[PDB]
Design an enzyme around this catalytic site. Structure first.
Site, PDB file in Angstrom:
ATOM      1  N   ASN A 112       0.797  -1.228   0.000  1.00 30.09           N
ATOM      2  CA  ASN A 112       0.000   0.000   0.000  1.00 30.09           C
ATOM      3  C   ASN A 112       0.829   1.277   0.000  1.00 30.09           C
ATOM      4  OD1 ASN A 112      -2.388  -1.416  -0.033  1.00 30.09           O
ATOM      5  ND2 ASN A 112      -3.105  -0.720   1.979  1.00 30.09           N
ATOM      6  N   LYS A 167      13.906 -19.361 -31.352  1.00 26.85           N
ATOM      7  CA  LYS A 167      13.305 -18.239 -32.061  1.00 26.85           C
ATOM      8  C   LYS A 167      12.828 -18.747 -33.416  1.00 26.85           C
ATOM      9  CE  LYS A 167      14.658 -15.407 -28.773  1.00 26.85           C
ATOM     10  NZ  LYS A 167      13.794 -14.589 -27.891  1.00 26.85           N
ATOM     11  N   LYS A 169       9.901 -16.216 -31.454  1.00 22.79           N
ATOM     12  CA  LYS A 169       9.281 -16.263 -30.137  1.00 22.79           C
ATOM     13  C   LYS A 169       8.000 -17.084 -30.173  1.00 22.79           C
ATOM     14  CE  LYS A 169       9.430 -12.577 -27.644  1.00 22.79           C
ATOM     15  NZ  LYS A 169      10.362 -13.247 -26.701  1.00 22.79           N
ATOM     16  N   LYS A 192      15.707 -23.319 -23.856  1.00 20.77           N
ATOM     17  CA  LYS A 192      14.516 -22.931 -23.125  1.00 20.77           C
ATOM     18  C   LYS A 192      13.459 -22.484 -24.087  1.00 20.77           C
ATOM     19  CE  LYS A 192      14.441 -18.838 -21.121  1.00 20.77           C
ATOM     20  NZ  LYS A 192      13.489 -18.180 -21.999  1.00 20.77           N
ATOM     21  N   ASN A 193      12.203 -22.751 -23.749  1.00 20.02           N
ATOM     22  CA  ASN A 193      11.090 -22.082 -24.394  1.00 20.02           C
ATOM     23  C   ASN A 193      11.308 -20.585 -24.315  1.00 20.02           C
ATOM     24  OD1 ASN A 193       8.724 -24.508 -23.294  1.00 20.02           O
ATOM     25  ND2 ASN A 193       9.162 -24.010 -25.440  1.00 20.02           N
ATOM     26  N   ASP A 194      11.013 -19.869 -25.391  1.00 24.94           N
ATOM     27  CA  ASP A 194      10.851 -18.432 -25.271  1.00 24.94           C
ATOM     28  C   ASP A 194       9.674 -18.254 -24.317  1.00 24.94           C
ATOM     29  OD1 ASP A 194      11.360 -15.730 -25.677  1.00 24.94           O
ATOM     30  OD2 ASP A 194      11.546 -15.970 -27.851  1.00 24.94           O
ATOM     31  N   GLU A 195       9.679 -17.184 -23.528  1.00 21.54           N
ATOM     32  CA  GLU A 195       8.779 -17.090 -22.373  1.00 21.54           C
ATOM     33  C   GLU A 195       7.273 -17.301 -22.641  1.00 21.54           C
ATOM     34  OE1 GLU A 195      10.816 -14.343 -23.245  1.00 21.54           O
ATOM     35  OE2 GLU A 195       9.268 -13.272 -24.370  1.00 21.54           O
ATOM     36  N   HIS A 288      11.824 -16.991 -14.955  1.00 20.69           N
ATOM     37  CA  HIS A 288      11.857 -15.964 -15.996  1.00 20.69           C
ATOM     38  C   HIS A 288      11.129 -14.722 -15.496  1.00 20.69           C
ATOM     39  CE1 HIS A 288      11.482 -13.954 -19.895  1.00 20.69           C
ATOM     40  NE2 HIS A 288      12.408 -14.785 -20.333  1.00 20.69           N
ATOM     41  N   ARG A 289      11.739 -13.553 -15.683  1.00 20.79           N
ATOM     42  CA  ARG A 289      11.282 -12.327 -15.029  1.00 20.79           C
ATOM     43  C   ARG A 289      10.600 -11.324 -15.960  1.00 20.79           C
ATOM     44  NH1 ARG A 289      16.918  -8.884 -13.933  1.00 20.79           N
ATOM     45  NH2 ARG A 289      17.499  -8.721 -16.144  1.00 20.79           N
ATOM     46  N   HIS A 322      17.015 -15.017 -14.289  1.00 21.06           N
ATOM     47  CA  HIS A 322      17.639 -14.065 -15.186  1.00 21.06           C
ATOM     48  C   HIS A 322      18.130 -12.855 -14.402  1.00 21.06           C
ATOM     49  CE1 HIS A 322      16.380 -15.613 -19.309  1.00 21.06           C
ATOM     50  NE2 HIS A 322      15.904 -16.501 -18.450  1.00 21.06           N
ATOM     51  N   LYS A 330      21.269  -6.236 -24.883  1.00 22.38           N
ATOM     52  CA  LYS A 330      20.305  -5.331 -25.504  1.00 22.38           C
ATOM     53  C   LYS A 330      19.397  -4.641 -24.486  1.00 22.38           C
ATOM     54  CE  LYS A 330      16.667  -8.785 -26.244  1.00 22.38           C
ATOM     55  NZ  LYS A 330      15.996  -9.691 -27.219  1.00 22.38           N
ATOM     56  N   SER A 369      21.039 -13.523 -20.314  1.00 23.35           N
ATOM     57  CA  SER A 369      20.243 -13.493 -21.534  1.00 23.35           C
ATOM     58  C   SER A 369      19.833 -12.073 -21.901  1.00 23.35           C
ATOM     59  CB  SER A 369      18.997 -14.366 -21.366  1.00 23.35           C
ATOM     60  OG  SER A 369      18.277 -14.469 -22.580  1.00 23.35           O
TER      61      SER A 369
HETATM   62  O1  LIG Z   1      -4.580  -0.545   4.423  1.00 24.51           O
HETATM   63  C1  LIG Z   1      -5.298   0.432   4.115  1.00 24.51           C
HETATM   64  O2  LIG Z   1      -4.794   1.579   4.122  1.00 24.51           O
HETATM   65  C2  LIG Z   1      -6.761   0.235   3.743  1.00 24.51           C
HETATM   66  O3  LIG Z   1      -7.309  -0.788   4.605  1.00 24.51           O
HETATM   67  C3  LIG Z   1      -7.535   1.528   3.989  1.00 24.51           C
HETATM   68  O4  LIG Z   1      -7.524   1.848   5.363  1.00 24.51           O
HETATM   69  P1  LIG Z   1      -8.275   3.173   5.888  1.00 24.51           P
HETATM   70  O5  LIG Z   1      -9.759   3.060   5.628  1.00 24.51           O
HETATM   71  O6  LIG Z   1      -8.011   3.314   7.369  1.00 24.51           O
HETATM   72  O7  LIG Z   1      -7.738   4.369   5.146  1.00 24.51           O
HETATM   73  C4  LIG Z   1      -6.917  -0.240   2.295  1.00 24.51           C
HETATM   74  O8  LIG Z   1      -6.292  -1.508   2.189  1.00 24.51           O
HETATM   75  C5  LIG Z   1      -6.418   0.795   1.275  1.00 24.51           C
HETATM   76  O9  LIG Z   1      -7.491   1.656   0.968  1.00 24.51           O
HETATM   77  C6  LIG Z   1      -5.905   0.192  -0.030  1.00 24.51           C
HETATM   78  O10 LIG Z   1      -5.805   1.188  -1.021  1.00 24.51           O
HETATM   79  P2  LIG Z   1      -6.628   1.036  -2.394  1.00 24.51           P
HETATM   80  O11 LIG Z   1      -8.080   0.767  -2.082  1.00 24.51           O
HETATM   81  O12 LIG Z   1      -6.503   2.323  -3.174  1.00 24.51           O
HETATM   82  O13 LIG Z   1      -6.052  -0.098  -3.204  1.00 24.51           O
HETATM   83  O1  LIG Z   2      12.786 -12.861 -25.391  1.00 24.46           O
HETATM   84  C1  LIG Z   2      13.988 -12.536 -25.275  1.00 24.46           C
HETATM   85  O2  LIG Z   2      14.353 -11.403 -25.668  1.00 24.46           O
HETATM   86  C2  LIG Z   2      14.989 -13.508 -24.665  1.00 24.46           C
HETATM   87  O3  LIG Z   2      14.604 -14.848 -25.071  1.00 24.46           O
HETATM   88  C3  LIG Z   2      16.376 -13.238 -25.234  1.00 24.46           C
HETATM   89  O4  LIG Z   2      16.350 -13.460 -26.624  1.00 24.46           O
HETATM   90  P1  LIG Z   2      17.602 -13.025 -27.527  1.00 24.46           P
HETATM   91  O5  LIG Z   2      18.818 -13.828 -27.138  1.00 24.46           O
HETATM   92  O6  LIG Z   2      17.272 -13.266 -28.980  1.00 24.46           O
HETATM   93  O7  LIG Z   2      17.875 -11.555 -27.311  1.00 24.46           O
HETATM   94  C4  LIG Z   2      14.974 -13.441 -23.133  1.00 24.46           C
HETATM   95  O8  LIG Z   2      13.712 -13.918 -22.707  1.00 24.46           O
HETATM   96  C5  LIG Z   2      15.319 -12.052 -22.569  1.00 24.46           C
HETATM   97  O9  LIG Z   2      16.724 -11.934 -22.490  1.00 24.46           O
HETATM   98  C6  LIG Z   2      14.749 -11.779 -21.178  1.00 24.46           C
HETATM   99  O10 LIG Z   2      15.365 -10.637 -20.623  1.00 24.46           O
HETATM  100  P2  LIG Z   2      16.083 -10.685 -19.183  1.00 24.46           P
HETATM  101  O11 LIG Z   2      17.005 -11.874 -19.110  1.00 24.46           O
HETATM  102  O12 LIG Z   2      16.883  -9.413 -19.021  1.00 24.46           O
HETATM  103  O13 LIG Z   2      15.053 -10.765 -18.086  1.00 24.46           O
HETATM  104 MG   LIG Z   3      12.553 -14.786 -24.311  1.00 25.15          MG
HETATM  105 MG   LIG Z   4      -5.707  -2.316   4.160  1.00 28.00          MG
END
Ligand SMILES: O=C(O)[C@@](O)(COP(=O)(O)O)[C@H](O)[C@H](O)COP(=O)(O)O
Ligand SMILES: O=C(O)[C@@](O)(COP(=O)(O)O)[C@H](O)[C@H](O)COP(=O)(O)O
Ligand SMILES: [Mg+2]
Ligand SMILES: [Mg+2]
Ligand SMILES: [Mg+2]
Lengths: 455, 457, 160
Positions: A112, A167, A169, A192-195, A288-289, A322, A330, A369
């Site tokens: 929050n 590739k 993808k 690896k599979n492309d993501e 994978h991120r 990764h 790149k 990667s």
């Molecule tokens: O933790 C908190 O702050 C709350 O319980 C609100 O408390 P209060 O009622 O005491 O303010 C909610 O989770 C937030 O509103 C989340 O934000 P949003 O709804 O924008 O995702």
């Molecule tokens: O989709 C792609 O681009 C890749 O397969 C690389 O391909 P290439 O080798 O052809 O560039 C990877 O998933 C990325 O590197 C992910 O980025 P990161 O590792 O930074 O999370």
């Molecule tokens: Mg990829």
């Molecule tokens: Mg809350």
């Protein structure tokens, strides 16, 4: 309303908080929004919304609640620095096995507080976990060693694992897909599979898995070497992930331990990572991120950094994650990102703010990667200091002029060149595939090596 | 290297892409980074990394692959606009039921393209899903109608559900926790776990569930009115979520249909939302979006907007999702956010770029929360246009000078004041709990109402 | 699940989407897997909907999985021929709860991208509410088709 007297104790010492081992520490770069409170006031509210409080006082609060308040214990407005200490009793635990969950950590430390109206932005750069909390996380169950063992490499410093991504993808039908796998495996170790690859209507999951299984067997019989594949099993549905994982292992049979499971951990979430980690602890979990850039980019002043994401993944149980090309590929990355790799591989390492003892928790492999090829590799290893890792080059391999197999061998020879400490241009004269990578990517060759063509 | 000729087709018309019903459309605000390619070149690489390609050409590419290429079909560099059309065949489907997954949508449309070195930033502001892809999503199985039915309200436009969050966020032990629940329920309908509350060592999960279950029975027996509770069941482990959910329903027994399940969908991810959605389709799924601010904030020019997050949540099957206070509360939000509410509640609505037909897919309740109290409510309702929703006020209720019960009644009377179209200060003279909200929050009262003290006490 | 969900698949308005043309595969029993699937293709050239006759399932001369596969192929062929969506209602009735799961789960995987074109038929009167509830709770996203074979024993005006 000002809650500094409650939620701020700058007289606390970081060294003692660490020694205590009862607090998670987090370091933020925060900036208050104009027209509200000063730094400590805004920081105080930040702590409240991240632990025990809200924006106003409530009668229901008792002294016990005050005992578990998080506390800002250090600030530096000139650098927009804010450090907060979270009592570990705050973080949620599983009813079923009493273990920790990263979801609770994320909800409190980076939840929050990212939507506060009185804050312009805030981003976590580091966090510390004490022993009592650290040991409650899964940690990785499979490591690069288990891949080394399958490849027949030494289990200690088994060396570089040559990898690629299939590739295009998306677009390859089952058999064209498997053919590319076969070609690369003639010279490489890992694929690896492309993501996003999975169960597309033009490339059904089970048909593709079967074709790849055939390709692995054919490649292994041809080369007499073991080959690895990392399958994407990402899905919204927990049971879909199991279905995919179970089919793959049964299909590959005696080659089942040649299989890694890829999970798009950032977009699918920790819940998906834990599904794979807990359902398939004996299979290498490939984190994978994709999508991480939305917050981790230095362009962003919100969320958390790549360093934080990587450290968390190790706690979640990623066998590998990764980490980027560290400025040599790149994608957005810096040479200083080497510190991320050390944090996830070593038993003790330094973060931007905190030193972390891992207490024998297994390491997470840095997976390299993103626009890598044979030419860019020598520079990359120089910055890191070792080659005990997986590197996947999609375009770098299948973009080779002589095909995927030649591409594979170029990656192999590039690392051998660095390990020998030889000059890349001179090295090329006795290694065609590596030399042919120059003609494959002449712009990279021209920049990296000024006069490679004459020589 | 320039890939415009492949991944860019500005001759395509949006009306044809929509009419075709074979493309997911996405609209981005993108800026190329200095020292690389121009806008269309950068847009082309963006599409490649988001569909079928990479940063260089590869021999493995065939015509079939080119057939499923995503395409930039509209650009406006002066406004940094970039629209992309994704063939629906690109998106992953479940082997088990052939249904869609939002994870795949995110991976392609807003995945690797967020880490591109030749792009300074790019953020999705809207997306369109055609019928063929739309019908493959779960959608909500439970709606506010089911909460209305329990309260004995009309199932259509059943009206305002008075709610709160148990505060402190953490620190209350099981029985003190349950005592606060009883107090509020004397005047209110709905209570939710604060997002991190679960199985803390000082407040064991099962002990709390049992204590709250007892409090519900006591409050309902006391008031003769039905009472609802939303339990946080968030966890990394799918089976932990089931364990928590199953224990709650069994414990509440004949009040099991009074239970909603809260999931921290943004930090735990779609996987956690789907676990709750598919394991407990008959229980109201309460999507908490904690952490969303990292990308959705206007301060951020990356990721996606709150509008996109909400639209996705409806597809995933959220019975309700937090949509914010729209500038009337403590969190970042604008009055224009009313459009988010309409998009998730209506069968047809307009986004910032795309018109969406929902084809009878169930609506998602806009859950209003974040520093709200009785004083701020009339203004919020004026901007939205209705009160058929859930509003939770933590500090607004338990921060009431006369306690949680009085706090509940202040929220009740505040909404009654807006629907009657009465003057808040004049309304206050005949409604104490509402009038006492002024003295509870005088700073808000002074700005919202200039001379309430003279008119009241 | 309701008719709205069938209308949506057929591309009809979800409100008053209109008449769904249907049939039952006849003979009631006796057709082998491919002759069965051939009849499905034929009807689908002019109709929308097809249901198993109530006893059709896993007869030794028409194995369940072989028939399910053949009909799935016929659906694809019919849809490719007409450019129109086609529905099928499979009987998954059984004494054993886990047999019902097995049949339903096999059907959805087999039909794959046409999984939402599938309804599940249950002989609710003779198999009982327990069987109906099995289908209802295990497959809430699939149209539940209640067949009332045997009902006449009590509901008939001849019976008091
Ligand atoms: O933790 C908190 O702050 C709350 O319980 C609100 O408390 P209060 O009622 O005491 O303010 C909610 O989770 C937030 O509103 C989340 O934000 P949003 O709804 O924008 O995702
Ligand atoms: O989709 C792609 O681009 C890749 O397969 C690389 O391909 P290439 O080798 O052809 O560039 C990877 O998933 C990325 O590197 C992910 O980025 P990161 O590792 O930074 O999370
Ligand atoms: Mg990829
Ligand atoms: Mg809350
Ligand atoms: Mg019949």
């Amino acid at each position: 309303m000002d809650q500094s007297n409650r939620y701020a104790n700058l007289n606390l010492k970081e060294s003692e908080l660490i020694a205590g081992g009862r607090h998670v520490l987090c370091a933020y770069i925060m900036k208050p929004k104009a027209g509200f409170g000063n730094f400590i006031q805004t920081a105080a509210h930040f702590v409240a919304e991240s632990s025990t409080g809200t924006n106003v006082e409530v009668s229901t609060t008792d002294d016990f609640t005050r005992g578990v308040d998080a506390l800002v214990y250090e600030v530096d407005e000139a650098n927009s620095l804010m450090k907060i200490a979270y009592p570990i009793e705050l973080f949620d635990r599983n009813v079923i096995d009493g273990r920790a969950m990263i979801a609770s950590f994320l909800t409190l430390t980076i939840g929050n507080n990212q939507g506060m109206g009185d804050v312009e932005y805030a981003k976590m750069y580091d966090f510390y976990v004490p022993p009592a909390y650290l040991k409650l996380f899964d940690g990785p169950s499979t490591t690069i060693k288990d891949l080394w063992r399958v490849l027949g490499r030494p289990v200690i410093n088994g060396g570089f694992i040559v990898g690629t991504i299939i590739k295009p993808k998306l677009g390859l039908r089952p058999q064209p897909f498997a053919n590319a796998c076969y070609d690369f495996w003639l010279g490489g170790d890992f694929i690896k599979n492309d993501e996003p690859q999975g169960n597309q209507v033009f490339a059904p999951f089970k048909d593709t898995v079967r074709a790849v299984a055939d390709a692995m067997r054919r490649a292994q019989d041809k080369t007499g070497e073991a080959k690895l594949f990392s399958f994407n099993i990402t899905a919204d549905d927990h049971y879909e992930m199991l279905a995919r994982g179970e089919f793959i292992l049964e299909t590959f049979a005696d080659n089942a331990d040649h299989i890694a499971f890829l999970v798009d951990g950032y977009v699918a979430g920790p819940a998906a990572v834990t599904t794979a980690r807990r359902a398939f602890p004996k299979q290498y979990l490939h984190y994978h991120r994709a999508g991480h850039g939305a917050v981790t980019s230095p362009q962003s002043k919100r969320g958390y950094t790549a360093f934080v994401l990587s450290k968390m993944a190790r706690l979640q149980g990623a066998s590998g994650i990764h980490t980027g090309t560290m400025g040599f590929g790149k994608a957005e990355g810096e040479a200083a990102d080497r510190a991320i790799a050390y944090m996830i591989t070593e038993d003790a390492a330094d973060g931007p703010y905190f030193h972390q003892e891992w207490l024998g928790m297994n390491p997470t492999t840095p997976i390299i990667s993103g626009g890598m090829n044979a030419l860019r590799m020598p520079g990359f290893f120089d910055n890191l200091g070792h080659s005990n890792l997986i590197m996947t080059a999609g375009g770098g391999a299948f973009g080779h002029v002589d095909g995927g197999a030649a591409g594979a061998k170029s990656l192999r020879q590039a690392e051998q060149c660095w390990k020998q400490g030889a000059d890349p241009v001179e090295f090329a004269k006795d290694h065609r595939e590596f030399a042919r990578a120059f003609e494959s990517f002449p712009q990279d060759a021209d920049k990296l090596y000024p006069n490679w063509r004459a020589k």
